């Protein structure tokens, strides 16, 4: 069995090329006995996934690279299965335990991406060279006192993190030895460099706004820190329920993950005047899944997304309505206009053997930006491997470098609750985690 499995076009941008998607699943586990029996069954359902759909055990390769031709990559074999590492941390007493996590919220700071995750984010680091060998998927069981991390690294230009969803989805079934639909293998088995279907006789038009990098222009690919920030429930609603009552005339409604987007870019908009003047243009870049604009399967594994782009001024955003800003965001997400763009941007990278140019953040300037990707909407909450422990405890993101004004929401909670990833420069965490408009509706994690 061989595969060469082109990726999807938008999958050829640089930026989504060098990096590994994390994220970790958290469960107790009530007795050190169990652990042989947790391996073997994620084991055997990594052997039937391979089984089913040989080219989850594959590895990414580039291949015609040269002077202003970046390359084209593929999937393509690799190992039998794909790599899990077993490390026990019971002992190690700079390690988590699940009491420190219950006491403490399951930090970001406890999820540290050198110690429970098989790789970094980052290509930073040994093994993250050119040359080396860039795995589909890779995965870590990380035994803690009375726990259980597990980690799943996802190659970027193979997955977004719905493809990824999709993936460790599948991977739940096979440990179950539960048996994969047909509309599942399908998915799973789409062409992927057909998926988005190129506009006819395309150079540069509106659609690639924002995602070509230019000389005068700032952005791209200090002293910063991470932090995870809570929403009960409550203050979801709540928060919903303010921008509803302040929307756009144009604007019917907006959504929990639209409100939540809005109240972060104007808290740090608020924060930010601080240290520049309110006239300092802002730009808010939101990730969106593209599968459906598309008309994609929700299953499809591969990586189908773009961003909407917003561009304020600091002091606007600031101090106008939560709905004037939630609009903002809706304002974007018409399908046919998400449609549009989206072929835009493949049909610009088909077209361009360099692709070196384009990126999802190409004029974000990091000191006045948000580069927001929600995971909210993702199924990991449900998934339990077969292992007997139940649902997990809590799903996060690994903590990895900062990169200001990145910032992720965690796959929601079924209660409802939120979970915001933000990276900031210290002087706007610092003043965010003091200011009272904030911490009215976010609990400080870290
Ligand atoms: C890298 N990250 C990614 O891949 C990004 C993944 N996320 C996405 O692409 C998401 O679609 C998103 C861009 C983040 C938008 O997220 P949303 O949760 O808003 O989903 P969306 O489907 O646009 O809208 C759903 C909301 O709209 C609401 N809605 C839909 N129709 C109506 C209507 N007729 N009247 C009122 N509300 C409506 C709906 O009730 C949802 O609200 P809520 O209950 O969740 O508050």
């Not at 994390?22 to 069954?41: E, G, K």
């Not at 009960?232 to 409604?253: G, N």
């Not at 292992?387 to 903590?399: A, M, S």
Request: a negative charge; glycine letters at 8%.
């Amino acid at each position: 069995m061989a595969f060469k499995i082109q990726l999807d076009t938008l999958g050829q941008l640089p930026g989504l090329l060098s990096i590994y998607t994390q994220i970790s699943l958290l469960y107790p586990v009530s007795d050190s006995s169990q652990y042989p029996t947790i391996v073997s069954t994620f084991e055997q359902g990594l052997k039937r996934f391979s089984e089913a759909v040989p080219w989850v055990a594959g590895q990414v390769k580039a291949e015609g690279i040269s002077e202003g031709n970046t390359g084209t990559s593929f999937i393509v074999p690799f190992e039998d299965v794909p790599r899990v590492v077993v490390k026990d941390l019971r002992d190690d007493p700079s390690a988590p335990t699940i009491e420190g996590m219950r006491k403490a919220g399951y930090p970001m700071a406890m999820f540290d991406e050198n110690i429970i995750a098989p790789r970094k984010t980052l290509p930073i680091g040994p093994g993250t060279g050119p040359d080396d060998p860039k795995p589909v998927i890779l995965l870590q069981l990380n035994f803690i006192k009375g726990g259980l991390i597990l980690t799943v690294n996802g190659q970027h230009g193979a997955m977004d993190m719905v493809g990824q969803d999709a993936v460790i989805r599948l991977l739940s079934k096979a440990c179950r030895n539960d048996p994969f639909t047909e509309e599942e293998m399908t998915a799973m088995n789409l062409d992927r460099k057909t998926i988005v279907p190129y506009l006819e006789n395309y150079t540069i038009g509106p659609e690639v706004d924002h995602q070509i990098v230019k000389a005068d222009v700032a952005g791209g690919d200090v002293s910063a820190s991470w932090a995870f920030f809570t929403f009960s429930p409550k203050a979801m609603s709540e928060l919903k329920d303010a921008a509803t009552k302040t929307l756009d005339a144009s604007t019917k409604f907006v959504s929990t993950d639209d409100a939540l987007s809005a109240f972060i870019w104007k808290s740090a908009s608020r924060v930010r005047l601080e240290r520049i003047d309110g006239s300092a243009p802002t730009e808010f870049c939101r990730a969106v899944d593209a599968r459906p604009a598309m008309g994609v399967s929700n299953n499809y594994p591969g990586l189908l997304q773009n961003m909407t782009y917003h561009n304020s001024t600091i002091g606007e955003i600031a101090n106008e309505s939560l709905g004037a800003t939630a609009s903002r965001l809706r304002s974007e997400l018409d399908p046919a206009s998400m449609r549009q763009r989206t072929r835009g941007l493949a049909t610009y990278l088909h077209n361009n053997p360099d692709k070196s140019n384009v990126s999802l953040t190409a004029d974000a300037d990091p000191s006045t930006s948000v580069m927001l990707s929600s995971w909210a909407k993702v199924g990991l909450w449900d998934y339990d491997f077969g292992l007997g422990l139940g649902k997990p405890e809590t799903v996060r993101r690994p903590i990895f470098e900062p990169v200001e004004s990145l910032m992720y929401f965690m796959p929601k909670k079924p209660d409802g609750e939120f979970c915001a990833a933000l990276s900031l420069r210290d002087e706007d965490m610092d003043r965010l985690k003091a200011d009272k408009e904030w911490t009215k509706y976010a609990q400080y994690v870290g």
